[PDB]
Every structure is written in C-alpha cells, then in structure tokens.
Amino acid sequence: MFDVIVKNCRLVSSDGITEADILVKDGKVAAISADTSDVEASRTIDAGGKFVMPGVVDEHVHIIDMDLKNRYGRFELDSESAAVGGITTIIEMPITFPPTTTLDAFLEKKKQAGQRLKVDFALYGGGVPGNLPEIRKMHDAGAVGFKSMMAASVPGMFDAVSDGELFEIFQEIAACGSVIVVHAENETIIQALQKQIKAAGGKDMAAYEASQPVFQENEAIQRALLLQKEAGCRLIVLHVSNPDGVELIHQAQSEGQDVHCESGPQYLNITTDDAERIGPYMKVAPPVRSAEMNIRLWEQLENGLIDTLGSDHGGHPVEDKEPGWKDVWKAGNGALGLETSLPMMLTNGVNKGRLSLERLVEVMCEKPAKLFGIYPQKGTLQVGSDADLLILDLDIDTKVDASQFRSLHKYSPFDGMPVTGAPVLTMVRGTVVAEKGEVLVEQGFGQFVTR
Amino acid sequence: MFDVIVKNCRLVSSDGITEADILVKDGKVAAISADTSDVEASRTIDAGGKFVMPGVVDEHVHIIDMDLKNRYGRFELDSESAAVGGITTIIEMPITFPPTTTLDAFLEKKKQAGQRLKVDFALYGGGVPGNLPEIRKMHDAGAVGFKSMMAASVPGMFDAVSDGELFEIFQEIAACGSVIVVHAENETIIQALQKQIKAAGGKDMAAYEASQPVFQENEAIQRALLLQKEAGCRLIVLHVSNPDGVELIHQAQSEGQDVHCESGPQYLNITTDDAERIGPYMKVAPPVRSAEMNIRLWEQLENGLIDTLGSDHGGHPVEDKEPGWKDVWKAGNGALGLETSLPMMLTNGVNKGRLSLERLVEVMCEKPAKLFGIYPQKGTLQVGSDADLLILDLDIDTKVDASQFRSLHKYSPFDGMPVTGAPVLTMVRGTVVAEKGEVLVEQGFGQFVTR
Amino acid sequence: MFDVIVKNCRLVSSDGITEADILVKDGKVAAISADTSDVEASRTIDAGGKFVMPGVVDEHVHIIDMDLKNRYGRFELDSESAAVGGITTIIEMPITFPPTTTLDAFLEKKKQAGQRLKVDFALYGGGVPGNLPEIRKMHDAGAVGFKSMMAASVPGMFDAVSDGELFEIFQEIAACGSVIVVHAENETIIQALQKQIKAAGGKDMAAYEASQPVFQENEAIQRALLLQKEAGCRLIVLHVSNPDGVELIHQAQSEGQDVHCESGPQYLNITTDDAERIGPYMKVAPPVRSAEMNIRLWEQLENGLIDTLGSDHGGHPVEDKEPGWKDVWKAGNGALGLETSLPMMLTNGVNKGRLSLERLVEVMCEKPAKLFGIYPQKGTLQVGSDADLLILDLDIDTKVDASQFRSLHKYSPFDGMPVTGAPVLTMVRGTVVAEKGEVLVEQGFGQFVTR
Amino acid sequence: MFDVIVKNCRLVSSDGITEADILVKDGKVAAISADTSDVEASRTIDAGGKFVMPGVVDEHVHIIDMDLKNRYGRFELDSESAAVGGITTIIEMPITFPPTTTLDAFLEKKKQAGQRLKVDFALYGGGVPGNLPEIRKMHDAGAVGFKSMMAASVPGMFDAVSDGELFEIFQEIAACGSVIVVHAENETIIQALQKQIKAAGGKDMAAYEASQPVFQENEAIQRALLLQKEAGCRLIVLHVSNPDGVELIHQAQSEGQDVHCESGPQYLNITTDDAERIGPYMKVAPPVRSAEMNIRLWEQLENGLIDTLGSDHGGHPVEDKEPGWKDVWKAGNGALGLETSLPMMLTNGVNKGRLSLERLVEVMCEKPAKLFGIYPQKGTLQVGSDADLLILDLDIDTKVDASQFRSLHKYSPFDGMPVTGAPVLTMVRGTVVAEKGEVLVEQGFGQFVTR
Ligand SMILES: [Zn+2]
Ligand SMILES: [Zn+2]
Ligand SMILES: [Zn+2]
Ligand SMILES: [Zn+2]
Ligand SMILES: [Zn+2]
Ligand SMILES: [Zn+2]
Ligand SMILES: [Zn+2]
Ligand SMILES: [Zn+2]
C-alpha cells in the first residue's frame, strides 16, 4: 500500500494549478491522481483544498557552523528555521572556518552536516586564489557548485579572486560541467569610495549604500558576464540588488549565454527608506537599494527577469550589529532569512497581488533545483521526486517575531512585520518535519543530495 | 475502474522524461503513477518503455474544405493524415470560401468541421478589411484567435490589411484578450521586385526566392512588432523563414513584448539547394531560405528562440503546381505537411542529435496550446488533461511515400525522404484513433475545443 | 583691387571663432587675413568685432508659387523674408501646382524662380508614384535632390508613395548619386486614429497631436531606414519632431548608414503646452511634441544628434487656419519660418546658453550645403566660396511682429515673442541684399545653384 | 611685408581641398588668398600645386630620454625623425626615469625637452598609484593630459592602477578639465594566460598574441568606458588593436560619452601573418591582430570610427629584441614609428585608395589637437595658427631604410617596405626644419605648447 496520501491538494507548479491527490511511497511521489477514494495508506493528510507546493530549495545559505558554530549558526538550530520556513533543501555556501576550499574540509563538513541538519542539503565548494586543483576533487566528491568572490567580506578566511584567477576558475567549472556563483562587486572601487566617504564624515546607512553604489555592482556583473562569455561555464550572479543589473544579465542570457540572475527577499521587501528605523540590521552586501528601484525589481520578478530567489541567510553575533546604530562602519554585513523568506514573498508578493503562485514556485523551487542539477529529485512533485511539500495557508494574520526564531541568532530586518501567508506543514521525503510551528524530527534527519 | 491504462511509458514533457503509467478515465488523464500492478482497466496498452508524448497541437492548418473541398482538402480525408501523423488537435485557418470572416461563416464551418473531422479542432476567425465588428462576434462564439495578412495570396477571397486596418485589428484583439497571428511580408515590395525580376526573364525557383527576399520579410516583421508594441495584443508571427527574423522577434519578446515566433518543418528540413530537384513542390510563402541560414535556424530551435512549430499544411490542385517546372510564376504556394511534420522533426532533429525530445514537445505541444489558451486540456499529460498521447518509435527505417497520404492531395516536398522516427499509436481523449498506419475512428469523432 | 572688405570680423565656423578680415572679389571670398591695413577696396564694411557667419542654407522651403502664387507664396515676396532672416540660399520643395515632378515643370520653375527670387536657390524634384523616369531627367537638369512622401498632405497634387514605389525611388536616387528626403509618417494609421478620435468628439489641438502620435512617426522612420539600408542612397529624414526618432536615425548613421536627421525651429521653440494660446497657427505635420521631449531635443541638438535645421516655411491662406480655433480638423498644416528661423535659434538657443554658435553654423550652414553637394560654394567662408555672410548682433531687444513680414502671408506661431539676436546685414555673392530690415536688391537677383 | 609665402598650394583640411596661397608672418598664418601676385615676402616657396597639409600632431610618443637617454631615445635624435616624418608637434608620454609623475620631474623634463627637441612639443603627466595630488600641480604647470595604465609594462618605474585608483584619477581629471588616456588591457588575465601558454611550451609570436587576446583588451575597454561614464572626464583609449574595441568605444561616444578611440599605423599596416618574417620587431602591446580584423580596421578608419592615429614611437635596445627570435618572452614591447607614420598611411592608405586625404588630416592633425585643446594653434592652417605645413609628394618610389633613421635606434617593422608618398618639406612656425631628408634646424628650436 502507500505510506501516506495527501488529498484535496490544489497542487501548484510553474505553469498552473492542478487539483489532485499525492500518493507517496518510500519517500518519493508514487502517484498523482484525481481520486484516491479506494486506496489504503498508513497515514492520511487532508489538505482541504489549500495550495500545495514543492519544498523550497534555497541555493544561498550561510549557516556557517564548524569552528564558528557558537558565533554564527548551528546546523541543528538554523535548519529548524528552514523547516518551519518551508525550505526543505539548502545548499550551504563555503564561507566558514575552516574554509570549505579543500577536499578534506569538504568531506568533514558533509559528515557534520549529515549528522546535525534537519532538512536536506547540498554543498558548495569554494573557489579561492590558489586552490584550483581542489575544485575537481570536490566536484567528484559531490559538490553541486562553487562560489568565488570578486569583493571580499572576510579577508584571510575567504579571499576575493582577481580576474585571472576568476577566469581560470571559470574554465575549470566549465570542464567539470559544474556551476559557479559569484558575489559581484568591485573590491577596489569600494575601498576608494569608503575612504572618500569616511573622510567626509559619513557614518550613515546612507553613507554605507553610497560606498558600494550600483555603478560598481553593475560593473562587476558586466565583467563576470564578459568572462563567462569566453569560458562557457554555467554562471549564477548572486544577490543582484538593482533593476539595471537584472537587465544586464537578462539581456546576456537572452543572447545565448548560460548566465542567470539571483535576488532575494531582502532586496524585494526592504528599501533604503527603511534604513533609519532598521539600521544595521539591514546592512547587507550588496546594499539594499532605493524605493524607485524596488518597484522595477518587483516587475522584473513577476515578468521572468529574475531567475532564482535565495535568502542569503547568515548570522552575525548581535554585538557586531548594535554598534552600527552610531557608526555604520562597525556593523557586519548579513541578515537571517531562513524563517522569513517564503512568508515574506507569500505575504507581500502573492497575497498583495504582485506575484503569482506559479512564478513563486518557479523561482523558489524549480529553477534553483534545475540549475544545480538536482531537479526531478527536488523542486517539483512528479512521479519519482522526493515527496517534499508544503501545505500553505494564504489566510493568516500574524507578525514575524525574531525572538521566536529557531536559529542561533534571534533578530531580523523583518522583525515585527505582518505575515498573511505561510507554510503550515512541511514534509521532506514523505515525513512531516514541521507542523504548525513545531519541528518533529531529530537532528541528522537531513540527507546529502547531489548530482 | 479505469477505461484504459498505458503502462511502461517514458513520458516526455518540456522539462524531462519521467517513467510512469497513465491511467485514463472519461477521456482524460485520471492519474499518473509509478506502478499500476493492482488496478483494473477495461483496456491495457503496454508502451514497452517507448517514449510517450502529448498529442501534437498544430496551430497552422489549411485543410480549407467548404465550397472548395474538392480542390484543396476535405476534413474527413486530411484529418486522417493528422491522425497518423500524431497531430491530435488542429486549428483551421480562415482562408477558404466562403472566408471565415463572419459569425455566420464561422458557425457553419464549426458545424461542418464537427461532423467530418477525425481529430480535435479549434478555429481561427479572419481579420480582413472592413470586418472589424465580426471579430468580437467570433471571439464570443469560441474562436481561439484570428489571422490577418500583410501580403495577400488569394486576392478577392482573403485580402491583406493596411497598417491602419492591421492596427485597428490589434486593438480589438487586445480588448478581447484573444490572439492575432499574421503573415508578415511586404506586399508592395514583392510586386515591385516581381516586375523587375520577370522583366529580366527570371522563371527560376531562384528567381522566385529573390522576388520575396528576407529584407522585405524582416521589414514586415519589424512593422508588426512596432504596432503590437503599441497595441499590446498577443501576437504570433507565422512561418518565419530566416534566422534574422527569429532574432528580431526574440529580442522584442525578450524586451517584454507579448510576441512569439513560429516556424515550421518546411523551413528546417528544406533548403534552396533542393530547389532544382523539388521545384514548385517547395514553392511556399515566405520562400524557403539558404543552406547557411538553415544551420542558424536549427541552432535557434534547440536554443529556444523559436516558440512554436506549425506545418502550414495546405493543398493545391496538382495541376497548379506542375506548370511550375517550366515557369515558376504559374505554380501556386503551399505544401502538405500534416502527415510529415512530426516524423520529419523526429527524423532529422531528434534522431540526428540536433533537437532534444524535451524541446520538440515544447514547441509542438506545450507552447501552441499555452499561447491559445487551450493548455491544461491539450498540450500535456497531467491529471485533468484530455488523454491525447502518441507512443513513439525512434528506431524505424522507411521513406515518406506521398501517394500513400490519406489527404485529398498526394504529393510532398519530402516525398522519398527517409523516416527514422514516427508515432506508431495516436489517441485522442482516451481512444485509439490511429494505430500503425490505420485510422480506426469514424468521421465526426473530432470535437471542437476552445477557451 | 578688391570689390569689398569686411573687417574686424569674429568669423564663426563649426569648429571655432577666428579673428580676421574678409576680402571679396567677383562675388567670392578672395582672401581671409589678419590685417588689411594697406589694401584698397571699392567698398568697406566694418563689422566692429561682431560675429560674422556664412549665409544660412535652408534645405526645407515651401514658397510654392507658380499657379498658386496668390494663395500660398510669391518668390519676390517670401524671398525678402529670407533675405532679412539671413537665409542666403534656399532649396524649394516640389509641392506646388503644377507639381515639380516633370522635366518640363522643373525647367519652368527654374526660369520663374530665377526671374523673381531675391536670394540664391537650388531645386528639388518630386518623386511621386509613376514618375520614376523623370527623376534621372531632373537630376541632369540640375536638381540637387528629390522629395517623396510616406503620408500625403495635398492628395491629387502630390501623392504619397507605397513602400515599393519608395524603394524604387531609393534605387534610382542611389544610381544618380543624388539625395532623397522624405516626410516620414504612417498614412494609414493616421487615418485610422483620426476616425477613432473624431468619433470620440475630439476637435482639440491635443486631439490632433494624438491622431499622429510619435509611435507612428517613428515607425515610418524605422521603415525608411530599413529600405535605405538596402538601397544605399543618401537619405535625409525631414522635420523629425521627437527625441526617440532622432536617436533611431543617429544610431543608424552611427552604424554606417548614409542617413541624416533634420529638425526645425518649430519643434525646438514650441511645445504642446502652447497649443491653447497659439492654436491652429502651430498645427504642423508631424505635430509639435511635449515639453518633456522638447528638453531632450535641445540636448540632442547641441550634442550633435541633429544634423540639419530647416524651417519648413510654408504659407496657407489665413482663412484656412482661423476655422481651426473651433474645429482643428478644418485648419491646414504649415507655418511661416523664413523670417524667424535664425533669430529664434539665436535668441532661445545661443543667447540662452543652450546652443553654441559653432554648432548653429554647422546645422544651419555647413551640413545642409555639404549633404546636397553645394558645399565649398555655400555654407562656409573660405577662399573660393561665394561671399555669403551675415553680420550678427546678439545684443538686440525686440519682438517678432508677423504683420511686418515681407512674405505673402502675415502670421506666425512666434508672433509677439522676444528676439535678442538677429542678422543685421546679409549679403550674397558680395552684395548687400538686406541691411537693418531693408531689402536693397531687385527681383531676379537670385541665382540658381547646383552640383 | 611677409616673412614667407607658400604658393600654389592644394591645401587640405578634413572637409575638402582648397586652392590658395599661404602668407605667414611672425610664425603664424597671416593670410590665405587666391592670388598673391603683388605681395612681397622675404622668402617664397612654390608648392607647384602639390598637396599641402598641417603638420602632423602625434599624441603618442615615447622618446623617453632623461636618465635612460642612451638606451631608448634622445630628444635631439628622435625629434629629427619626427621632422623628416612630417610630425611637427609631439606629446611625450610620461614613461621614463625618473617617471614624469611629479611637478619636479615635470618641470625638469620641460626644461630639457625645450633645450634639445627640434619639433614643437606638449607634455603628459603620469597618473600612477599614490600621486593623485601631483596631477593638479602638473595641470597648472601646463600638462595637456595624463596617462595611466591598466596593465603595466615597466613595473617599479610606471605602475598600473587598480579600478579604484583609476576611478579617483578620472575624477581629478574631470575636475581639472584635462584629458586622461589609458592603456587598456587586463593585467591579471594576461598573467594567467602567460602561465598557461608558457607551460604548454609556447614561445611563438603566435603564442604571444594569444597571451593577450582581444577578449581581455576589450574587457578593459568596457571597464574604462563604464568608469568614465560615471566620472565624465575626457577619455582617449590608446592604441586600440581590434575592430570590436573600436566599435565599443564608438557606440559609447555615439551615446553621449566624451570618449575617443586611438589606433596607429602599426595596427593598420601590419598583420599577424607577418609575424614570422618580422618576429620580435612587431611585438607590441596590445598585440597586432589578424588579417581579417585588419580589413575591418581600415573600413572603420575611412568611415570615421577611429578618432586619432598615434605612432606609439618607442625604442628598445636592439639586444632586447633579437633574443625574441628564439624565445618571444625575452623580447620587449615597442616599435619606432616617428619616421614611418605619415609615409606608411600615405602609401598604403591614400595612394592605395582606401583612405582619403581629408580623413587622414582629420585623424592625424585636427582631432588630436582638438582633443587636447591646442587646436587653432596646431592641427590646421587658419589665420592665427602656427604656420606648420608639409608639402607632400604622392608620387614617390622608394623603400623605408631603418638604418637611415635619425633616431637613436635604427630598426623598424616596416624596414624594407615601399613608400610611395611622403612629406618633402616640413616647416614649423614659419621656418623650414626639414627639406628633402635634411634637418636644417639646431637642437632646442622646439617650443613648449599648451592650453
Ligand atoms: Zn555575497
Ligand atoms: Zn551570501
Ligand atoms: Zn502565410
Ligand atoms: Zn499559412
Ligand atoms: Zn512634411
Ligand atoms: Zn515640408
Ligand atoms: Zn601602451
Ligand atoms: Zn605607448
């Protein structure tokens, strides 16, 4: 018989809602049918006609853990935020200590992650100066992709690469048939502008944004684009903060380049005119942009110019944020988002009419899985896929309360904001891991995913 | 129980092949499941692991019929070509006599088509000078879209519209939320060039192609594009013959315009250096282009720049073609394609490695259905869709024999060419209409489809 | 010795002001020198250090004359407006009756023009449907270029050509090495829009502008561009009214196409928010555009995107304008400009800081002469050129008084507007034809110019 | 009276040839007249109707001199090459030792240059990391512009700047209203490619070209363009070697950016398929490109896409070139060109019909002078300009003989090539400095020019 049947689902995919029931066996979708009146299942879930979507696949997560677990994030804590947030599979970036830039470091993180994570996961390897030969190694060990930075953030730990190093990395990535994602900003210009701005006595959030303007973010995007154009590797530009950058990438992919654009809920749901009340808790890199650009971004999203959405969830000890209120240059970059990503998009996007459910599923589930090659398995509900669903409730009334976060850190740029939609049940591989705010699975439940 | 079960299917969609069985009831897909070992069905079909795809949806068909049925095509004859060709639903153009440019003419064609067609169908209305108010009427009667010509072909019967008339039609179409497809060429330039070329004594197929060069085809595309840009109606440019035109449209849709590009097997599988041996049987409008352009076209197809494929199946009394061997200007335009469309794409595209099955299904099934709004119903195999499938056989060895055609006319540009892949079973709404070359259904079986 | 010496000139050319004296003999510049202290001349003019520029060459004039001289304009009257306006050579369009579309009509107009004009002149031939062979004839008789319309204005008298006819004309023009200028608008769309707008009861100036929107003007420009791209003839798009059209042409010339952009003082010095007080006296085709577009236009001018400036001077019996106040559709298109062109540019351009003298001379003297091949002779003051100068006075204070116009008609869109700069002496071929508002030469003084 | 009269000149400017005589007094053009039959001059030169053009203004010269004068070039020697080559004013780059990156270094070079140069000169200042405040100083001391490198060549002596440093330099330049020229290549990518190529055992000229491919040259151009777009300073991209780069710059200037393109006779008259016989004597940076690209370059030149031509004359001890025959990586970059620039363009451009005299004068005389603000003075022959002419002879038959060079070094990529046109008399400020191969002026004759 069947392990579980979720019935009366208004199942959503990127191209439409279909009414059916899902039959799951051995952790995967065994069948999708119009009527299950006469089939037996050990467990039965009635969706009661609510929307059911595939588990969210977040390609941009910084739980960090490892030697810095007591300062940034713990697999067993933050992965609970994912679970309640409806994010069933994450791809951990390699920014941590030790840096995931070695086969050894990689194998160790995989072992650890597998023992403490509560949702499924895939892993990135790091592409830093001088570790070129390790890339092939991590690829063979299961890494789905790699990250390189054009502008650092944690010097010594994870360094930025020069155009030549970046170019060599692009060639290796192309030869392995992997994926390379980059943080595109101009390191050198940011430094110059910081000095000019600091000298003029700027300590604002406004001063911060100006030190890393769009023209430099866009120059880096342009540069990465020109180099991929020559290397041919699949490239994803991470957290693109402005409309013009989205267009640059779109235009290029539209011309045949295997390049894609990622943005995130922080850039869509926050504006520079929130800088004053949110302060350092909104300090992220690239900077959140203007209200005017924000409008454009939302149009591009619904219209298909933004390929994927990633949270860029990443903690920072609260004591490295608070000093930012008086002097911005003393607060670190980052914002948690694992627990607020879906509800924020559902709330200000879907329930506010500026985003369709179909598109949301495309950018938060399908494309990320597709781009990394973990597709049929994650990202959709078809016969053969892992049974990763979310039963949604678009008629909720509540607020985001950062202190209730399951992650190591308890603060958020969205703290206090209203939430009108959210996943109320989330299951991975056929088992309920979170139901109405409760995680029901033990640490280690999460499996490594690849291909 | 179930009416029929097709098992061991290697089911193909635009984004991948999934292994499952299809359960159909009351003419629609009732379920898709990994295993059907213990379910009862009146009839059982074993695909034996062959590829199964949705029935092909051809948006560009000219069976014509009506008062000219004994000269161009008959619903009960040509629709049999569709059936064996794997084309389960067609959309008849309104070029016939009387012209389908009136609510009355429309209602009459629907009645007739419904009584004699063997595959399902949707209908176009015509947008000609002076019939503006009839458009709203046909829309309300179920027309899925409309056609207008920028360059005539059958003066008196179906006339070309001027930019102003075309613009007014675009506005009506936008207001109805319908679709407008156009034949884009420059009537006036073609006439001028014809005179110059005829005067120089050109009677070639080469002379023909030169009389309707790409620069004029592309100018018309550019013009239609500028007008839709202003009207906002969904626009599909029919049979685009050259790479540059495809790019123009792609660029524009890529900029936000709801415009799409259609091409067909005649333009992909035939080249001007076939002109000498095929002669007038290859004379179509727009003209088939050069071998060099042909290469580009094939790349654009696999790469996603070509949105849909339509056969542009259309007969002409064989006595209006043969005189073309000696004097090209005396042969009419047109080519049959209902029976050779899929096998030609399967043969020279899929089985020759320059086209993926996934993409083929996208341009021959999904997009056409989607663009006209008959989607979930036709174009895919999901729970709720009409059970329209094709069991394929990509390991065939045979030739196309025009004399075996089931249509009124028995000739083809592809006559004699090899066929290595073809549908071997085709069913619409759960019933086998054609099995290994035999039509098994009576005239009238076809239903009207809309929305 | 020398016939005349103009000393203490601050001589302006497109690339700078140089301080010197001009020595003229036998109607042409015989020398330019830093000091003329010891040379004898029959007559001596002291510019006293004021700016001296070449006579303005206006390529877009509609004095009309001929059988309609008592209704539109007379050579001996309007050419006096040119003289005081600083326009030393004009190129008469062929829109008149009889139409200058024949060798005979051309020879007759040349004879007449030569007997009554007071400034020098060049002539256009007409390119209308069916007169293709006359073009070669007029070219050989001295025509500098030809005009064709894509949207009519005086049906029966001068007709618009279709794309095919226009294309054939382009080929003839290329083969003769002549110039073709066109009025680019979409005839058919304008008609459709007129009907829609009239039906909704529009009788405004606003209603007028909307009936011939920019999208149709720009479509025509795009179309002409595509056809010249194929023909290779020198093309000048006349009176371009909007920024986007200027860009389209600029982009194309920038890509190697021998195409150029013309605009005029009516489009730079008038805005739609002047429509209410100026009414029908501002009704011209293409329509004057918005204030926002006006700003762009001025930038493009100073920046080099606008190649030439032409007045498009053309009268209309005042009784065909006045009824326009109540019903716009009953007023004819056109505006006088021969007497207000330079002063308007000098006043609102140069003296207002948004246009440099150097650029003004480039677009009003040099380029027009250059494009038509009458260059060294007209358009500059070099050794060998006709001595055509203007002594300017950029420190004037006065108003334009249409009733003082020397032309047949006495009204203007600029009537009442202030004038702070104007030519105060104008001479052609070494003789003063106008000095401080007085014409001093008899009818017939004007010579035919060509090459 | 007059110091000298050059009569029967067929005087050429960017827009045409005019027949006249030039009267010079006190080193400048005092008059230009059609006939000088009755004027007295101390000296009389009869051009006999040959073409007369302004002295060539070369903006890209590396005589170097200073502490390295016995190794690279001497002002009194190389300036003689300029004189016979028809180059009347040069602008010395600041790459030398000590580097011209200081007010002191600048003042010293000016003193020296003024005492030993034989043709007139202007000076560049250097923009290197850390000397930002010196720029304002050199500007005030008369520097016409500054140079910065994006890819080094002489590390330690002249360093490349990072994007931030380059950006700060752009801002200073904009604020001073000066000019900044840059060497645009990607330093870091070149290094990476060098390693890959050397490892594969490449020691070719072919191997060299591949180590600094067009994609990296063009990326740097793109980058400089984006930064100027933001800074607004006048920018000239030096020695652009390929068609695509020319287009990138052209497109940008065409969009309003004050950016310009420079190329030189080495890139137009040499091709990679000359690499084998010329070897290291053709090794320059950026590398000379392919024959196919060469064709494009020549079209762009005559068509106006290339703004200026500079020789990039620069010596290298012959012992640092010869080892290049066996191992390319051991030969230095550079090529002499002061003596072969004009004759090479005259010979393979003008006398071969692919370049007009008018355009040649525009890119070799007018624009360079204009862009640096030394215009009316240098670059043309108008009343008030320095009398700098060249009497040309386009009917010569001879070969370039590097051993006859007047410069310190005696070798050239053009050695042995035919010369069919060349200046046969060259004068600066009214005095003959070179006549038929003989320099007739003493060292120090050259004056400093500025503004
Ligand atoms: Zn980042
Ligand atoms: Zn991140
Ligand atoms: Zn057609
Ligand atoms: Zn058709
Ligand atoms: Zn007009
Ligand atoms: Zn006109
Ligand atoms: Zn250089
Ligand atoms: Zn150099």
Bound molecules: zinc ion
Q: Gyration radius of chain A, to the nearest Å?
A: 21 Å
Task: Please report the first level of CATH classification, the CATH class of the largest domain in chain A.
Answer: Alpha Beta
Report the CATH superfamily of the largest domain in chain A: Metal-dependent hydrolases
Assigned CATH architecture of the largest domain in chain A: Alpha-Beta Barrel
Distance between the termini of chain A: 30 Å
Chain pair sharing the greatest interface: A-B, 25 and 24 residues
Q: Classify the fold: give the CATH topology of the largest domain in chain A.
A: TIM Barrel
Helix content of chain A: 25-40%
* Total number of beta strands of chain A: 20
Structural category of chain A: alpha/beta
Report on the biggest sheet of chain A: 9 strands, mixed
Give the DSSP E fraction of chain A (strand runs of 2 or more residues). Answer: 15-25%
Shape of chain A: globular
Kindly give the count of domains of chain A.
2
Count helical runs of chain A.
Answer: 13
Quaternary class? homotetramer
